[PDB]
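Job type: complex structure
Entries:
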Amino acid sequence: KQVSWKLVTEYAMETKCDDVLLLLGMYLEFQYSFEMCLKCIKKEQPSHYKYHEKHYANAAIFADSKNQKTICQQAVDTVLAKKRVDSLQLTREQMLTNRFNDLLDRMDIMFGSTGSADIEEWMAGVAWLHCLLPKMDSVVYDFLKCMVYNIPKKRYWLFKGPIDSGKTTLAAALLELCGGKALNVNLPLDRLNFELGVAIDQFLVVFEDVKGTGGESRDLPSGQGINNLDNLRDYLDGSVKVNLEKKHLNKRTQIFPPGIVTMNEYSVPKTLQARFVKQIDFRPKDYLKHCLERSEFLLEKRIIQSGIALLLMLIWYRPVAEFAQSIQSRIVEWKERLDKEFSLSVYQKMKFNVAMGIGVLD
Amino acid sequence: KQVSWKLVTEYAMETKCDDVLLLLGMYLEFQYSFEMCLKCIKKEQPSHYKYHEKHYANAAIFADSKNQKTICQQAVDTVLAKKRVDSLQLTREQMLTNRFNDLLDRMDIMFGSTGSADIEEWMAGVAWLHCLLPKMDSVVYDFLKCMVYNIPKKRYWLFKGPIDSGKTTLAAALLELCGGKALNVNLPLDRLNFELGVAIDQFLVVFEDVKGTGGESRDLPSGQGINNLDNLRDYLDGSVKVNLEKKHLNKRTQIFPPGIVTMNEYSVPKTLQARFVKQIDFRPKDYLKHCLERSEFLLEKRIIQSGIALLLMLIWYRPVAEFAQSIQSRIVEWKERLDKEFSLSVYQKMKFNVAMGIGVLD
Amino acid sequence: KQVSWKLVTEYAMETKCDDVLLLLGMYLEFQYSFEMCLKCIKKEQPSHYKYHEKHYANAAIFADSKNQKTICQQAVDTVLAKKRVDSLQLTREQMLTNRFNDLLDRMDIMFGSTGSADIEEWMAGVAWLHCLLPKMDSVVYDFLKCMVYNIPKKRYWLFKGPIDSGKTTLAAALLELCGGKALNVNLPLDRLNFELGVAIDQFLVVFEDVKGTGGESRDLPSGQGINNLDNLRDYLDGSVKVNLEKKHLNKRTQIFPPGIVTMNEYSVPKTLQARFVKQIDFRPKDYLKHCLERSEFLLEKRIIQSGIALLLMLIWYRPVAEFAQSIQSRIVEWKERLDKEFSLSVYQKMKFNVAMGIGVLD
Amino acid sequence: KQVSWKLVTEYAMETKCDDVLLLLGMYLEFQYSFEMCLKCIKKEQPSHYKYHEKHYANAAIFADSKNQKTICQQAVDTVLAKKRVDSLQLTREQMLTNRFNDLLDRMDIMFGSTGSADIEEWMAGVAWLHCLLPKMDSVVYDFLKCMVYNIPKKRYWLFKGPIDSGKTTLAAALLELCGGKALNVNLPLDRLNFELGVAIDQFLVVFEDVKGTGGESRDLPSGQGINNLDNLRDYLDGSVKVNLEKKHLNKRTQIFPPGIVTMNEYSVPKTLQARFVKQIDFRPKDYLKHCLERSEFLLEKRIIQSGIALLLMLIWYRPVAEFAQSIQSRIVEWKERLDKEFSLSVYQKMKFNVAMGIGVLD
Amino acid sequence: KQVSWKLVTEYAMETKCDDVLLLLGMYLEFQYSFEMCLKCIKKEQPSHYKYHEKHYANAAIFADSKNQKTICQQAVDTVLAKKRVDSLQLTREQMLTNRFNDLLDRMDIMFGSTGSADIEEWMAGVAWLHCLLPKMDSVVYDFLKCMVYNIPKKRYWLFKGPIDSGKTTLAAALLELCGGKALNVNLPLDRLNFELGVAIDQFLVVFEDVKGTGGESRDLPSGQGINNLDNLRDYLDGSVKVNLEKKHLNKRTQIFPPGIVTMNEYSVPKTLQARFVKQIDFRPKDYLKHCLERSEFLLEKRIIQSGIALLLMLIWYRPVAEFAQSIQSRIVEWKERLDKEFSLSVYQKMKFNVAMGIGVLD
Ligand SMILES: [Zn+2]
Ligand SMILES: [Zn+2]
Ligand SMILES: [Zn+2]
Ligand SMILES: [Zn+2]
Ligand SMILES: [Zn+2]
């Protein structure tokens, strides 16, 4: 008869769905009666069971509509349109909070009665991660203030370390905790703009394993990253705007995003060094290594490189007033859940274990 | 009057047809009275003789529509919308089971009333395959678990061996048993990424015949494939996601898929070797070659390279509960079939014939 | 019923919105009863809280339209149609005044009731800037007349100096004060034209840090930029029109725009030198650097690189009749504002503080 | 209600408007009542005030139309269609006359009561230009006959001279007087077709500053123009047609346009020299130089390089019967205006001045 | 009311108009009352004054249509649909006759009541041409039969000679007499195919000035054209079909067309020589050059390079039955015309004048 384009757009907006084919796929499942809906009955997908009923009617009509694709388009352009609006109107903190709400959205599910996640294992992760660096929760917190504040010449951290030293792991967790893209600058000085363009509208950036020509004896490859980074002093300290290339042209003109530079121990030009407001040296630690050997589940379930592991660390160490007013009530909610589940002594034993190199859950 | 776009879509989703021109051409065959259709009477194509009846009416109206291709476009987009949903909602074991179910549909027809396949020649294929490697049936089960469990740093197998040793054959059947694309890393470090993008949305990948440097004294061409793999540690052990490309622009981001590397015996760098959790050395065997010389059908009919020969082996060796609940009813059904046609001593003789290199069927 | 495409276009032309997705997303915010809109009550975004009322009705009908993007496309095309007319019908002084009027709208909000800007920190910016160069305020007026008069062979200024001398900062504020793109001539003689096309329809251009040959003994990278400029005598002094490119094909033909060349102290060919009607030598000064060291806000808040700091200086120094009639009413309005908040002795002390290198605000 | 697509097309055709965005922009201004139209009241734009009234009604409806863009398209295709018709049907003289009418169209405005042009200054231009070469008006006239006659092997003039010798100026004026494009052939023998394609449908062409390898001692660069010109003998003498490349393919097949070759004093191969029916040597003259020094307005208002300066010279020296019947009445109109404004003696003093090197208006 | 798309198509097919913008612009001229059309009264363009009457009505309705270009698109597509049919259904002799009929339509106007052509100057062209080669009129008939018979290994003629010997001229007229494109094989072995694709659907091809290696001692530039031709034995003698390209992808497959190779006297490989069934050596002659020196019109009006001069020669020399039946009525008609204006002794004197090198018309 007459399908509602606005009812579909609603579904898209509340699913943060920007995929046309995916939107279409999702919506066509609601055409069946939800009465004997197994997907709902078995609560296998939030993006499904939480909306099937309110959409049955519409979906059933959608199923007999001649331009399903076109309808989905507008619903998607609406989501992309909202994302274009937040880009130009939200403060970075508001940005960071939406990110947090999302990661939290997952946690409710992962750790929910339907999820498969073992919260004990994810708290074994906080403990391990908390042994990777001194005052790690204060370290994570600062990075955040740094990223949110995005202040000229004080927005880049340098993670310098060997290999299997932690930098890659922590940068990965931080990357996921804040949102953002990793970038490879060890490339042809001309096939560079290509990658730099990936930074467009990204909250923070991570230049992974930058390599330098200088240095070779100690077994480190060549690469031109360090060389290139030094030619991007304007993108790094962000005093003025910059033009980014994507789609094979000149799209956005913006302040280049703040972030991290993961490095393997080369010689860094003073002109480049001056670009980083903080530098962390990661040195391999035996107990941390053995510990993993005996705590396989940490690597096997990709827990220590999860920004979710880092969001749990903040909720577990940090005070509520440190979060954005808007989210606090949801954090408190979690603290209580977490404080009802683990005693400080249990957690402390976990760190003690990581310390003696024997797997957190012993 | 008014063509039912819905029905056409139903046929598309039932035939799993993702090709617009292929769908169009097939639906239009139904426009003729089935009350005489020889294609149906003679049961020529299941994709036809199982839907002609139900679709005559609507197909008859279809052939008189002024925009049949637009209709098929939506039927197809719907098929792709589903393949997109399952791409994110289904678990790997479910992905595997769907593959399985699809191979069984193929088997139902091959060995059915209106089919050509000679099941005796296909068990001969299993017999030959179960002589190629020790505990071969445990190897395939193991491989399947490795691929489904998809655990960081334990997702790749390395098949090494001269030409005509069997790694290519098993690697092919394995590919078809699981679904997935083969890739070629023997390209210029810049042509790589295009290829690596092929793995997008894939279950598993097979790096076909990687070439190394060193060994040209033993008559082996120097290539950069090995060298590239060592620069793909990220992709191989997949501890964190990665960005894949196509259409000359970035598409999906994900955990590179797990898989196999087929190699010809070049020396391997210890850093690369470490990415393989398992290595299988193939050596050409005389009796196996002699067996084929006296059993041409195994090659001419491409049986020992077929993933169906591997699904068949599983059904023949493996215990029903080792399969997913959902599919067991269909498996027990095939075991019975098989058991009712082949005794253990008969199958046992085939293996004996291969051992003596004379002709599985002698 | 029937969405009013006209109204949507009116909003677009009033918001000066040339982005389709940005327009769509914003108009759709109005679909909610303003009789409660917190975005309005809290006066979050002027682009919203000044039109929600007037557009509720129509936006409410808009959200129920089956082709919102097509509507926005026309709204946008209309905005571009105007930017195209003024491109040919407006005089340079009018072009400049429009720029000015736009910077004042930005200032009205920055220093308004619902804004963050700290005007005291912005006059401190002016104080620091009026110490960077002698008779700085006469320099900006001069520059503006040069740019508006746009006279052949008297349209370019050359800023020379080491790094951190101030040419980059002034050149940035100047750019933003006038509008226009920066270009990079440090490219292969064939990659040039693409870049040169960027200047199309622009008011002025800024050739950022051109590099020469000679001087590598003083630690300066050899580049071909200078060399290229000498091959662009036509563009620089613009006595006759030129053909500019984009989209990989020839577009507009015109007088290349006037502008600035920022350079690092390479020797200049007498033929090139002649194209510059004015040259400004920047030398890093100690007190100015010390001033910033004790006045972080000037950098962290990007004040001394802002074109607003220059418009602010003009308003503070220049006589009202030196502006275009049309804009004077708005200028006198700002002078009063300023005069009512800062006495000459206060502003005079700031300049004194910079001289002593201690903190404009001490 | 029902907008008139033909009324908009009229507007486009009488504005010679081929710009869609521009057409749209122009037309949308007529939607407002012309009663209090300031643009009209102030007569600021002919393309506006001369048509606002006859279009009010239509424009007001156009403003509420849903496909303004589409309407404008057809109106533009109509103008492009008319231009395609004149290409294949007008004699070159008719072509040259339309050009003249247009330049005249401007003159009425420049020198009208609304324009800003000083006719005395533009007559100072004729005088100066008339001192650049002997019998200059007869020279200009001939060139025209040459260009209009476009006769095999008698269609190319060679302007050979140093620098700041006049050739560039006169070629620029001639270029504008007749219509046409400038071309750079000092390029890669393969990136040549690119430029040559610009000549498509052009009335005449000008190869600016062709450079030759031969010659270097006298301080002249290298370049490959002379080299290339010699490989285009077929494009130059135009005995037979040629294929031009634009849009990155093979568009038009036509007789290559006639024109000028501006050169800097290299060695010209006899085979190339034979390509030019006339050759003019320009040698720097002191009085002409000083004169400009004292007659800045000539260069500052881009008067001496204007084809308009050259159209004024013909109207002032040449007899009416020398013009096309169609335009004569309009020229006579101008002669009278000019003869009413300046006495032969006043003009002669102007030349005398240029002769004594002291600025024409002394 | 309702524009007649059919009529517009009829005009297109009658005008043979395959250009959309050209059709649009022309049909729109008919929208004015023909009851006054000066273009008609003055008989300016046959494409106009022969259809204005019949199309006023419909063209008047056309100018008020909301999608004129869409209408013209179909008119054109229809013209191309016909050119496509005849491309496969017509015989070569018919292809040739159509060409002929088209050249006669051109001649009917050139030498008609409302035309400029001076037939006496065109017979002078024939006289000059019939002195360029012995039995010239038999040569053209021969060539035509060769081209129409299109027999494997007997389809190509080779014109050899210095510059200004006549091969270029005859080869040009021959091209225009038959229709077909010229191609340039003096390209890099990889750029070849693009060019070779030009010959698609063509009647004949002319390989313009092929260059060889050897002879640089006689002042002849080394090129790879000859070398390429030797690698095109397949194309040249066409015993079997070939694949031709365009739009950066494979199009038509066919017998490469027959044609001429114009060469400058480079040595030829015996394998290449064999592909030419006929060779014509041109040597510059003094009397012929002197004739032109005293008969400028032959060059200035491009007469001796015109295919019309060759059709004219045929009509003047050849017996009526040597033409196709269908066209004979029109040929006898031209013979009479000619016979009624030129006596044999008059034409004979022209040939005598050329022999003495004095001016065909003396
Ligand atoms: Zn459901
Ligand atoms: Zn059937
Ligand atoms: Zn609001
Ligand atoms: Zn007006
Ligand atoms: Zn007419």
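Summary: Residues 243 and 253 of chain C are 4 Å apart (CA to CA). The first strand of chain C starts at residue 156 and ends at 160.
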